[PDB]
Amino acid sequence: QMTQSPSSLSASVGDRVTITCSASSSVTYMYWYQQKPGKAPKLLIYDTSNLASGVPSRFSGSGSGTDYTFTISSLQPEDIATYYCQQWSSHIFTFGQGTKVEIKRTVAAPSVFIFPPSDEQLKSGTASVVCLLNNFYPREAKVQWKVDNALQSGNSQESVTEQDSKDSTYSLSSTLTLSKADYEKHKVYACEVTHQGLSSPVTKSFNRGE
């Protein structure tokens, strides 16, 4: 049975990243793939230690008996990905469980933006209100929706991007969903953002219909 370790890791830019796979047998070589989010897996190392064409030099692979090692000698922002080892063994190709590689970087405060629903959506029955948190670190953030100073719950959903391949930041989108009737019933719409990079919670607001 193939064992890839660790499952995830965080390191700084310029750090050495080390990933291991232990194999059932030594008679076939080990391969290493890089998978960025949304993209297909990309071969980086073949035949245990050969660099694939185009792959930068900071990537290397080695093996000794049934123990194999993949190394990024100097972690770069674009290297965030899940890495997999792969070996042919007992008439099949087996992939490792994967190693998610993340970047530790300096604190950065989110840029907050609020978007009222479009007239087109509103008049057709529903109002989606959107709060955008742009390019922040670390990942942890609190978004609170306020309607006429009343705190909302059960009626919002959010999602976060994968870490940015250039600046190692995250971005967050929060949607407040209301009926047309409930939306037109109120004036002030606000999102309150709590994040480590802000010295106090930041509010972004608009008044309906102006």
């Binding site: 479009s118 959107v130 989108s173």
Partner: protein, 222 residues
């Protein structure tokens, strides 16, 4: 350039069958094996099997009962067919090829993947709404704008800006599953606020399961 182009994402009923296609361009690809790989959402990679055109097939034991691999030599298209589909078959399916060519160069090529979703629920294209730039978008000489992509099924949706000409400052968020059982996502972009009067911004939303493409112009509100 060498490319593997796969058939678009599809919803299929439980018990039904689907046939993913993989079209090879830029290389001869007659004397190389074609691999099929699956990746369940948020999971790892599993090898399904391999097919030789020049005409044997090797299967992973787990996928012997569920998969059938074929090829069309005249069109340069490999096919993988999944029978008696259940919820556990919901996954991205990749075609891939790795070998030495005629000139002895080592290659590895992958298709873009095909998300097969297994569900009784029907496909639905998205409704697209603007996320308009305003005074509440100005932060320091730059403004944020976007597109809300609402009420589609199944995954996935891809989004570009100005047909791919606008790439920097773009964030396309992962979809949320709503209480209604329909997906919603946003895509945003930060631009100079001095561009708002003159530059045109259009989001291009693709949803292949419903065969729908939507372009939406995003303007400042009057």
């Amino acid at each position: 350039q060498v490319q593997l182009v796969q058939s678009g994402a599809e919803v299929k009923k439980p018990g039904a069958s689907v046939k993913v296609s993989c079209k090879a361009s830029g290389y001869t690809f007659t004397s190389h094996w074609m691999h099929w790989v699956r990746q369940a959402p948020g999971q790892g990679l599993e090898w399904i099997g391999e097919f030789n055109p020049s005409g044997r097939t090797n299967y992973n034991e787990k996928f012997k009962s569920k998969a059938t691999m074929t090829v069309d030599t005249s069109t340069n298209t490999a096919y993988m067919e999944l029978s008696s589909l259940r919820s556990e078959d919901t996954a991205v399916y990749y075609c891939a090829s790795r070998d030495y060519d005629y000139d002895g160069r080592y290659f590895d090529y992958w298709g873009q993947g095909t998300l097969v979703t297994v569900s009784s629920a029907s496909t639905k294209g998205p409704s697209v709404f603007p996320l308009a730039p305003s005074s509440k978008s100005t932060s320091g000489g730059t403004a944020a704008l976007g597109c809300l992509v609402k009420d589609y099924f199944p995954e996935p949706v891809t989004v570009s800006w100005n047909s791919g000409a606008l790439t920097s400052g773009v964030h396309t968020f992962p979809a949320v599953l709503q209480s209604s059982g329909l997906y919603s996502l946003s895509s945003v972009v930060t631009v100079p606020s001095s561009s708002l009067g003159t530059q045109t911004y259009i989001c291009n939303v693709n949803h292949k399961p419903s065969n729908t493409k939507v372009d939406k112009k995003v303007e400042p509100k009057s």
